[PDB]
Design an enzyme around this catalytic site. Structure first.
Site, mmCIF file in Angstrom:
data_model
loop_
_atom_site.group_PDB
_atom_site.id
_atom_site.type_symbol
_atom_site.label_atom_id
_atom_site.label_comp_id
_atom_site.label_asym_id
_atom_site.label_seq_id
_atom_site.Cartn_x
_atom_site.Cartn_y
_atom_site.Cartn_z
ATOM 1 N N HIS A 351 0.781 -1.239 0.000
ATOM 2 C CA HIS A 351 0.000 0.000 0.000
ATOM 3 C C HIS A 351 0.819 1.299 0.000
ATOM 4 O O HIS A 351 0.235 2.383 0.014
ATOM 5 C CB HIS A 351 -0.964 0.031 1.187
ATOM 6 C CG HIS A 351 -2.028 -1.011 1.128
ATOM 7 N ND1 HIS A 351 -3.260 -0.785 0.552
ATOM 8 C CD2 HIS A 351 -2.050 -2.285 1.576
ATOM 9 C CE1 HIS A 351 -3.990 -1.881 0.637
ATOM 10 N NE2 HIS A 351 -3.281 -2.804 1.262
ATOM 11 N N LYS A 542 -8.546 14.168 3.797
ATOM 12 C CA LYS A 542 -7.645 13.010 3.818
ATOM 13 C C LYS A 542 -6.737 13.253 5.009
ATOM 14 O O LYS A 542 -6.679 14.372 5.520
ATOM 15 C CB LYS A 542 -6.797 12.912 2.532
ATOM 16 C CG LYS A 542 -6.103 14.218 2.134
ATOM 17 C CD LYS A 542 -5.455 14.178 0.737
ATOM 18 C CE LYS A 542 -6.476 14.161 -0.406
ATOM 19 N NZ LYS A 542 -6.485 12.870 -1.174
ATOM 20 N N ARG A 543 -6.032 12.222 5.456
ATOM 21 C CA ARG A 543 -5.087 12.401 6.559
ATOM 22 C C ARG A 543 -4.058 13.499 6.238
ATOM 23 O O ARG A 543 -3.683 13.701 5.076
ATOM 24 C CB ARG A 543 -4.394 11.075 6.880
ATOM 25 C CG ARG A 543 -5.323 10.045 7.510
ATOM 26 C CD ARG A 543 -5.765 10.478 8.908
ATOM 27 N NE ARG A 543 -4.612 10.525 9.810
ATOM 28 C CZ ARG A 543 -4.317 9.581 10.700
ATOM 29 N NH1 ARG A 543 -5.108 8.520 10.853
ATOM 30 N NH2 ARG A 543 -3.230 9.712 11.456
ATOM 31 N N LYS A 548 0.852 14.518 0.843
ATOM 32 C CA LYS A 548 -0.475 14.835 0.311
ATOM 33 C C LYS A 548 -0.610 16.333 -0.019
ATOM 34 O O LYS A 548 -1.576 16.753 -0.649
ATOM 35 C CB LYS A 548 -1.571 14.374 1.278
ATOM 36 C CG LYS A 548 -1.737 12.856 1.346
ATOM 37 C CD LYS A 548 -2.568 12.422 2.561
ATOM 38 C CE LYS A 548 -2.737 10.903 2.673
ATOM 39 N NZ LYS A 548 -3.541 10.305 1.531
ATOM 40 N N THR A 650 -8.220 6.700 -2.630
ATOM 41 C CA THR A 650 -9.576 6.192 -2.833
ATOM 42 C C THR A 650 -10.577 7.315 -2.656
ATOM 43 O O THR A 650 -11.676 7.264 -3.210
ATOM 44 C CB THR A 650 -9.940 5.044 -1.874
ATOM 45 O OG1 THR A 650 -9.655 5.454 -0.539
ATOM 46 C CG2 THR A 650 -9.151 3.778 -2.210
ATOM 47 N N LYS A 654 -14.221 8.469 -4.693
ATOM 48 C CA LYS A 654 -15.469 8.854 -4.022
ATOM 49 C C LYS A 654 -16.043 10.159 -4.588
ATOM 50 O O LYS A 654 -17.241 10.255 -4.864
ATOM 51 C CB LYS A 654 -15.258 8.976 -2.506
ATOM 52 C CG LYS A 654 -14.715 7.705 -1.828
ATOM 53 C CD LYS A 654 -14.455 7.928 -0.350
ATOM 54 C CE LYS A 654 -13.582 6.796 0.221
ATOM 55 N NZ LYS A 654 -13.090 7.124 1.600
#
Ligand SMILES: O=[N+]([O-])c1ccc(/C=N/NC(=S)N[C@@H]2O[C@H](CO)[C@@H](O)[C@H](O)[C@H]2O)cc1
Ligand SMILES: O=[N+]([O-])c1ccc(/C=N/NC(=S)N[C@@H]2O[C@H](CO)[C@@H](O)[C@H](O)[C@H]2O)cc1
Ligand SMILES: O=[N+]([O-])c1ccc(/C=N/NC(=S)N[C@@H]2O[C@H](CO)[C@@H](O)[C@H](O)[C@H]2O)cc1
Ligand SMILES: O=[N+]([O-])c1ccc(/C=N/NC(=S)N[C@@H]2O[C@H](CO)[C@@H](O)[C@H](O)[C@H]2O)cc1
Lengths: 810, 810
Positions: A351, A542-543, A548, A650, A654
């Site tokens: 992952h 998101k985290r 990110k 992911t 969504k």
């Protein structure tokens, strides 16, 4: 009210009402005079759960009679969220329950809000497991999710003075109506001890025993009457534990701490003994359960024909040496046969490629905690390296690179290397990610065993992520193409025939507007925050991680603010910029990023010149139930990780399903999303993977960007000088220092392209009709990203089983 | 089958069967193919508990509408035992459930054995609370028992190598069907902190908060449709507790340890901080609950008219300063009014005169844990001593004797003195005990306030202790005098008219014989121990304590053995001598006594010359469920405590009701039992209280007895020389040393009379007809010892409320 929510038959409604009243009386011990809203929620949960029971028993009986190959999905995380609505959806009970509660004078949506999230995960990996269970049930696979029943899930996030505070997520406080304790299947798990060698082989002795008690939660398929099981283990001390007397009883807590709390690290490895204990605990209890079920079908040759074990990352990697231990030490199989069985049984999903996220356990920890497993790992490593040596004779550096044992200051076991050696299949989670695995971090392994390496692009379940959270969109779609798409998402392609249909365009835009109004009201009521629902909803949830690049979003936000301040009377497309996500409690830079976001909001949201043209809101306590609310409301999905760092994502999928356009880098699944929708229907910007590599070879110099982009220099000077923290001028020095001198993720290098791309977004939003047509093009091509497709691929290409859409009898 | 067990109507049986099947399916998630005996127990428990619900809700609604005076029974112990059969008995459901289960192919008695005892007590004090709750419900009083929900109750006792081993009583492992969590009534309890004095009075600040979560258990009355509540508090950490992150979550255990485990001391005080925390925890949460309920009826003048608080020993004595704290600090009442309310509200029951059992808390503990309560206690003491000074001017020694504050090495608070000062009534638990209180340990207090001192002789509930455990006896009684005696035990006196009735004599003896056969089989099956059911069953069951003189019983046993060995071919009445009971884990001498008993058994039970004429068995793990089995089987009840040491006893009453004759000292309730039955129908021996006092004045010299009784000398020489421990000749040196030089309980002084009295028992047993007639005389006069009588006296003479035998509507 709406069709996709099912029938509200006279018989059904009458029955639900009486069963609701029965539970309120007999189960909750209340009458209507003293009953609280929480009591009402529980009465409904019990009423709905009653409908699962017959199907649950008959599904498991079916698997016993038919004896199909069983799939065991091992994960340390299952991010389930709430269960009530999901169950109603999958059982076609939603309208009936809505009607029944309405007639009882209750609002079902209000009752739904009372349920705690089952927050047994951190983010994407945990929610992937949850989506997968839903798809496996929907696809009629004999599948079991195995994990840990954490007493405390992911912490609840509170924002105090702009800073993240953590509080314990005591999600079991009121009881969990969706679990059944199964104390009769309690199993012993061993720790510590020592290895003795006898005439008749090795024996692991003098161990400490902790009990593993299972709790079963049903996983219903979508209207197929299949109900699979998620089995979560809870740690229990044996009764003679430590058995002055009082202290010995109080010390039972030590054993039970194993299942107490979820480690809150997203994409980061912390070599803590308690974590190792959790990993072995789930693995040891699960494998005994698997073997027990297999024997109740002596000959382990057929083991891989009846069992598949999927390892969700390396967290349950100890399954490999644990299976070897059982087969060799307890069943007395020779090494070579045990190994064949093990390899054919296990498959490994990677992952992440971030080095700090890779599990490398110190040898001294394994030596003390799991002495027999260490010996087995050494043996695996010796035999594996002998194969490498024969394949690549004389290549001594390859030998040290591929070793499961890392030499250095502290010797470590590379769990990823263990997983590859002991699995018949290794997959990444998006095409670009899987390619990077073969090309970079596992190149040596790919060269040795190319057949092992696969791709299985991630997906999301369209039950939770469309029907449940966005019934309005689900309905306008079903009005045109029927209901079949809900379990065959590829059918959404039929919507391309409506891209010029004026009625459909109006309906898509109307559903979005309604979602935005509903979310804007949610914000006022629950958080006293006021937003303009006619603005573009610009969402990054998101985290919080440096990779990110929430920081890049922040820089865009400040640019917009500075441009407004510069030319106050110029028209700009109004935006509500929403950023949300939790930071790992030990991750300082992530906590600083949250503070930055709130600090920017504090300036932007109270500047009279700005007005309602720009608002910056930090979405507190982002979690599955919040995702279900904000995602349907979003216009713009921010997917802006540095190319090569987000394995898949992911959240991106969504948003695509729910009618937001995407601004993103060519990273993870974004690449395949752009490929499906067409690059013209996506807002792509920034360095590709190859551009990042080129920049690394040359050396990334952030100063160069600072020197050449005046708008960027202004922002850095504002940050440094204390513009966003007047009473603490140096508050953001760490952030500036990182950006300027130690930025692993090249925030500045993508800045210009990002801002320009954002201008193109604003331009399109000015034309509502064309914005919506591009939206329809995204929704229409989002079919590939159903986890039903993903799971069908796992089933066919890894597990060797055929999915089935056939109903079990009701 | 038998009449007292109720009707088995066609309608009822059909309904029970379908509800049983419903629970097995919907509640347990099982079908008949996979269901274990434990599942069957749970299905029955849920089926039976369903019948309580309507009555429980309507009883509490009744109390809300009628607003009677409420009785709060505060105890740290509720020794409830099993609940299933008790519930069936009180609801008249036993025969219906027996029939329903029979038709389902199940044996109800087997299912009953699966239920764990609720072992939330040590012995007599804990079981007294349980009997009292049953009687209060049966007498229609608006009564609530308040205590702690210990996660671990009294330890399970295992005998290994003749030694007691303790294991955790994990009684909640499978879930408790008899409780309902009430998280909505969760209350904060404060600890530590400091006191600030403001213009507006004292304030307790900077405290640590622990949450008190209530769990409600129903207490059904006997066939009157009354269901009262026992509310037990569980300790919970608040969610921001200690809120690096992982440790903070794990540290929640510290707060929750408060309700983790029952302290296993019977009649002994250990000044441990955790115990103090438990005492305050139950008191603080309970008082808030009481006040909340009182306000939902401003004027606290009426508080004592609507509230009675009964303190079960000094364990909840902090209720007195806690009530003062709330009234003075929070409600702003002046001291004198607050005090009047407090005194009129609280009553105190003393359960022991043993000095080592009295609670004397170190001042430094209260100072740290409960700084405000210490200040209030000091103030209470000052005002109290001013009253003593005015009543007895110049008597300075009285002042120091009566002080709540004890001076010395460590200053201590005498909790008993606190309770007397702050209560309107103080009672002992048997006539001789209450007299001793007025004459000795509380003489000074009696002289000051004679009106406060009362007697309330203990009792037992004839529901559990006759109907439930001895249906055969209950039935032969009901055949003659009807069923009314079950809630009016005085009616048993009518049995005196049957003392010469040949049919009744035969039936009483037959019921005993059947009970003995059933118990003899229980022993073989569960413990592989073989006994002669034609022997006299000589039983001493109770906690192991020096004052209870299990050692004196041991000396008799050895005497019998030595006499047999001396004259092997002489006839002796065969005996099975059974001794059972737990020792407190820290009580060395008690653990040695257990070892002695097993060691005696090891010699006696394997001596071929003895044969089946003498058997000595240690009854392992004595607890309420075991009492229900052994007591109906007993012929001889050993109640042989040194005169003046057993405050009441209640085991004595259980045996009397169930057809055993009593050998005992004139101690505790034995005196009143002998008075009721007639001294001719009792085996009384030994020193009276006055004889003990005389011996103390002269000085007790054990050597004198050793010198003058050859049979006693032989036993001591056997013990010393290693006759009962051949491989460890000095094993029992501590016991011999204690008996010879430091025996506080004068074992030797009662030895001769005991043995002689035991000869008279054996003589009577030789004549079965006359043995049984004396038994009938005991059963017939056991009516006074019903806890219904006891509670009716509390109600009238202390609480100021009238009992009612009137039914609530069904
Ligand atoms: O989701 N479904 O379909 C479902 C789940 C459970 C049951 C039956 N459940 N039956 C029992 S007795 N559930 C218990 O309930 C307690 C809380 O009340 C829990 O604390 C405990 O862990 C749980 O075992 C039935 C159906
Ligand atoms: O607590 N610990 O020690 C811990 C917890 C979690 C991790 C790793 N967590 N890893 C995640 S959540 N990986 C995510 O997986 C998603 C699903 O494939 C991808 O879409 C996404 O691109 C990827 O980042 C590592 C350590
Ligand atoms: O004795 N009666 O009369 C009674 C007791 C309880 C109820 C209703 N009970 N209803 C619930 S949901 N009981 C729960 O059950 C769990 C175990 O299954 C417990 O762990 C938990 O503490 C308890 O609250 C109904 C009647
Ligand atoms: O754990 N701690 O700290 C603890 C526990 C219990 C006690 C005292 N326990 N006290 C008992 S069990 N007292 C008993 O009460 C019975 C009922 O009146 C009497 O019949 C009997 O004569 C009397 O001994 C003291 C301390």
């Amino acid at each position: 009210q709406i069709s996709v929510r099912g029938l509200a038959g006279v018989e059904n409604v009458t029955e639900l009402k009486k069963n609701f009243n029965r539970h309120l009386h007999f189960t909750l011990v209340k009458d209507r005079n003293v009953a609280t809203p929480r009591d009402y929620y529980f009465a409904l949960a019990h009423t709905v759960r009653d409908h699962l029971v017959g199907r649950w028993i008959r599904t498991q009986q079916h698997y016993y009679e038919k004896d199909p190959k069983r799939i065991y999905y091992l994960s340390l995380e299952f991010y389930m969220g709430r269960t009530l609505q999901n169950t109603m959806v999958n059982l076609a009970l939603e309208n009936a329950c809505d009607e029944a509660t309405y007639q009882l004078g209750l609002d079902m949506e209000e009752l739904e809000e009372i349920e705690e999230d089952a927050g047994l995960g951190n983010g994407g990996l945990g929610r992937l497991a949850a989506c997968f269970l839903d798809s496996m049930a929907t696809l009629g696979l004999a599948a079991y999710g195995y994990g840990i029943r954490y007493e405390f899930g992911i912490f609840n996030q509170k924002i105090c003075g702009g800073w993240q505070m953590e509080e314990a997520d005591d999600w079991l406080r009121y009881g969990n109506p969706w679990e059944k304790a199964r104390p009769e299947f309690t199993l012993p798990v061993h720790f510590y001890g020592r290895v003795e060698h006898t005439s008749q082989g090795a024996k692991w002795v003098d161990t400490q025993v902790v009990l593993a008690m299972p709790y079963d939660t049903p996983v219903p398929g979508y209207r197929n009457n299949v109900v699979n099981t998620m089995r979560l283990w809870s740690a229990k001390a044996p009764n003679d534990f430590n058995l002055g007397y009082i202290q010995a009883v109080l010390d039972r807590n030590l054993a039970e701490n194993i299942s107490r709390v979820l480690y809150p690290n997203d994409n980061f490895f912390e070599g803590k003994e308690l974590r190792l204990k959790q990993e072995y605990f789930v693995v040891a209890a699960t494998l005994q359960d698997i073997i027990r079920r297999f024997k109740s079908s002596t000959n382990f040759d057929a083991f891989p024909d009846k069992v598949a074990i999927q390892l969700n990352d390396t967290h349950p990697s100890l399954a490999i040496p644990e299976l070897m231990r059982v087969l060799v030490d307890l069943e007395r199989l020779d090494w070579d046969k045990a190994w064949e069985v093990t390899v054919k049984t296990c498959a490994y999903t990677n992952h992440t490629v971030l080095p700090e996220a890779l599990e490398r356990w110190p040898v001294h920890l394994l030596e003390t905690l799991l002495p027999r497993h260490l010996q087995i790992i050494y043996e695996i490593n010796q035999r594996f390296l002998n194969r490498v040596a024969a394949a690549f004779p004389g290549d001594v550096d390859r030998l040290r690179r591929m070793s499961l044992v890392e030499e250095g200051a502290v010797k470590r076991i590379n769990m990823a290397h263990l997983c590859i050696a002991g699995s018949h299949a290794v997959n990444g989670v998006a095409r670009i990610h899987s390619e990077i695995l073969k090309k970079t971090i596992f190149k040596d392994f790919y060269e040795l065993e190319p057949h092992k390496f696969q791709n299985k692009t991630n997906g999301i379940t369209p039950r939770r992520w469309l029907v449940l959270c966005n019934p309005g969109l689900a309905e306008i779609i079903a009005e045109r193409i029927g209901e079949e798409y809900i379990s065959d998402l590829d059918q959404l392609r039929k919507l391309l025939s409506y891209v010029d249909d004026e009625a459909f365009i109006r309906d898509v835009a109307k559903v979005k507007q309604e979602n935005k109004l509903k979310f804007a009201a949610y914000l006022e009521r629950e958080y006293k925050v006021h937003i303009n629902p006619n603005s573009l909803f610009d969402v990054q949830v998101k985290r919080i991680h440096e990779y990110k690049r929430q920081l890049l979003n922040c820089l865009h936000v400040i640019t917009l603010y500075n441009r407004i301040k510069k030319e106050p009377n110029k028209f700009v497309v109004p935006r509500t910029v929403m950023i949300g996500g939790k930071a790992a409690p030990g991750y300082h830079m992530a906590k600083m990023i949250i503070k930055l976001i709130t600090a920017i909001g504090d300036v932007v949201n109270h500047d009279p010149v700005v007005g309602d043209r720009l608002r910056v809101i930090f979405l507190e306590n982002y979690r599955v139930s919040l995702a279900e609310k904000v995602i349907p409301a979003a216009d713009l999905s921010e997917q802006i990780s540095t190319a090569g760092t987000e394995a898949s994502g992911t959240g991106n999928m969504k948003f695509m399903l729910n009618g937001a356009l995407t601004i993103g880098t060519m990273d993870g699944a974004n690449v395949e999303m752009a490929e499906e929708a067409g690059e013209e229907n996506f807002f792509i910007f920034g360095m590709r993977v190859e551009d990042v590599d080129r920049l690394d070879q040359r050396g990334y110099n952030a100063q160069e960007y600072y020197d050449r982009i005046p708008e960027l220099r202004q922002i850095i000077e504002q940050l440094s000088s204390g513009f966003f923290s007047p009473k603490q001028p140096d508050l953001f020095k760490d952030i500036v220092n990182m950006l300027m001198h130690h930025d692993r993720f090249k925030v500045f290098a993508d800045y210009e392209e990002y801002v320009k791309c954002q201008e193109r977004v604003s331009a399109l939003y000015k034309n509502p009709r064309e914005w919506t047509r591009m939206v329809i093009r995204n929704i229409a091509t989002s079919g590939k990203f159903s986890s039903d497709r993903t799971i069908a691929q796992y089933a066919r290409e890894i597990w060797g089983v055929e999915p089935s859409r056939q109903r079990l009898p009701a």
